[PDB]
Amino acid sequence: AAKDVKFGNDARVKMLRGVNVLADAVKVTLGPKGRNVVLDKSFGAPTITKDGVSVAREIELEDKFENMGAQMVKEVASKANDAAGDGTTTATVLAQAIITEGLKAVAAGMNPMDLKRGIDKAVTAAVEELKALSVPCSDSKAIAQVGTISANSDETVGKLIAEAMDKVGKEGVITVEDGTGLQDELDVVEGMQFDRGYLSPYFINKPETGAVELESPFILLADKKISNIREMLPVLEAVAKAGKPLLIIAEDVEGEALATLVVNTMRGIVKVAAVKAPGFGDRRKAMLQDIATLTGGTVISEEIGMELEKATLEDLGQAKRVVINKDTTTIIDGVGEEAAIQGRVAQIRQQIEEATSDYDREKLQERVAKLAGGVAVIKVGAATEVEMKEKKARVEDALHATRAAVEEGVVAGGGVALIRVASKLADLRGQNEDQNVGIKVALRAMEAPLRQIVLNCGEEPSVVANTVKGGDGNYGYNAATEEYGNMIDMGILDPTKVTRSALQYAASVAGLMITTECMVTDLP
């Protein structure tokens, strides 16, 4: 009902102090010599963690305006983590630096619009410089190296990732799953992955990764929107009597159907997951047909008179494993005739020759490559099961890091890339002097994360940052060994995508907060 409103400097200082609390909580964990943050748990055993993700997720300030500021910075940091795969702490500390300096400038009387424009100009220049400075990661040796560093110096993990990407390609779909035995088994199976997520997070079976993982499930491919249930209840009865989980891939399943599916899933009487149909228009129908051919089943379409009432087990697609993340889903080893797959890829290639528009042509290349390439599975082997779990988690993290490195490149890790780019961009200027002030704010902000890492290491940050700026290339300061040298030589590297995303999202949130003249929140 009644709401509190803050205008001008009061709202901005509220946001600044909230962001300060969040960044002070998170940034202490940054760096190889990170600090420990105790997250008190109501169950009884407090947890000690050194990752900024958990600390950021667990923070919620009591004051309303402080809470809003901290939560919005946390939201943009989580966006950076979801996109790049890492760099939440770097994004948070960069955002804190930009916000502090920009608010100090605004309080002097600087124009927020020009400050934001200068900050964005500096950030775009920094992204271009990072792209220029990035070391390409295309050789299998470089892939193995990125795998090793991304997995705490494990040659086996890097070798597995490198050979998996060799078999599936740089852009191929590669997934990791638990495997029996001690040795690591790598196999390739016929499957596909389309960028669609679960309609509700209530279907999640693995809270560790938030992935709806299904083993040997049935998939129901519907060409029509589903709102009611009574037309499709026999499908639920059939999958229940079959005893195996069911996957729903329709144009959209929402309303009472989604509600009853979520309720049943929480009840546990039946385990059924629903994911939206990829694409739209005729493309959606084409890829639904592609998935139907992959799974050996058929799609139910209202236009051809095939109702959901007649949908039974014989016309129900079946797979081996299904992994549904927040944004992407993966069907693995869908059982189906190889002749059908060959016919489908041949027909799509034909359509490629008699395609005319470039957009349709590139979409057809994407579809045929995705369908024909398949998905390889890497099975983690270890002596003890807990070791298998930790190794599989490390393999997943290393796979994400390697994928990011392939997508963008590899730069110097430990914040050296950002400070090097900031030193390189010392002479950039904008139209207004306010834009120059904003550019200087951005430069100091990109200098900040290395200073924080050095401060966590215990060394003084000023002289170390000055020495790193004095050098050129990937030369910087190693926090672990307290020595200088080339980061790629020392192996301290991060994907260019991670650094670029952290910088971009910190810039976005800083621009949003600097240009905020009013806050509205519920009354305490």
UniProtKB/Swiss-Prot annotation:
Q: How is its activity regulated?
A: During the substrate-folding cycle, the two GroEL rings separate for effective substrate binding and chaperonin activity. Ring separation is triggered by ATP binding to the trans ring of the asymmetric GroEL:GroES complex and avoids formation of functionally impaired symmetric GroEL:GroES2 complexes. Activity of the GroEL-GroES chaperonin complex requires Mg-ATP. UMPylation of the chaperone by SelO/YdiU negatively regulates its activity, and may facilitate survival under stress conditions.
Q: What's a single GO MF annotation on this record?
A: isomerase activity
Q: What is its EC number?
A: 5.6.1.7
Mutagenesis or variant effect for residue 1 to S: Complex stability is significantly decreased.tuberculosis
Q: Which InterPro entries match?
A: Chaperonin_Cpn60_CS, Cpn60/GroEL, Cpn60/GroEL/TCP-1, GroEL-like_apical_dom_sf, GROEL-like_equatorial_sf, TCP-1-like_intermed_sf
Protein keywords: Acetylation, ATP-binding, Chaperone, Cytoplasm, Isomerase, Nucleotide-binding
**What Pfam families does its record include?**
Cpn60_TCP1
Please give the name of this protein: Chaperonin GroEL
Originating organism? Escherichia coli (strain K12)
Give the encoding gene's name: groEL
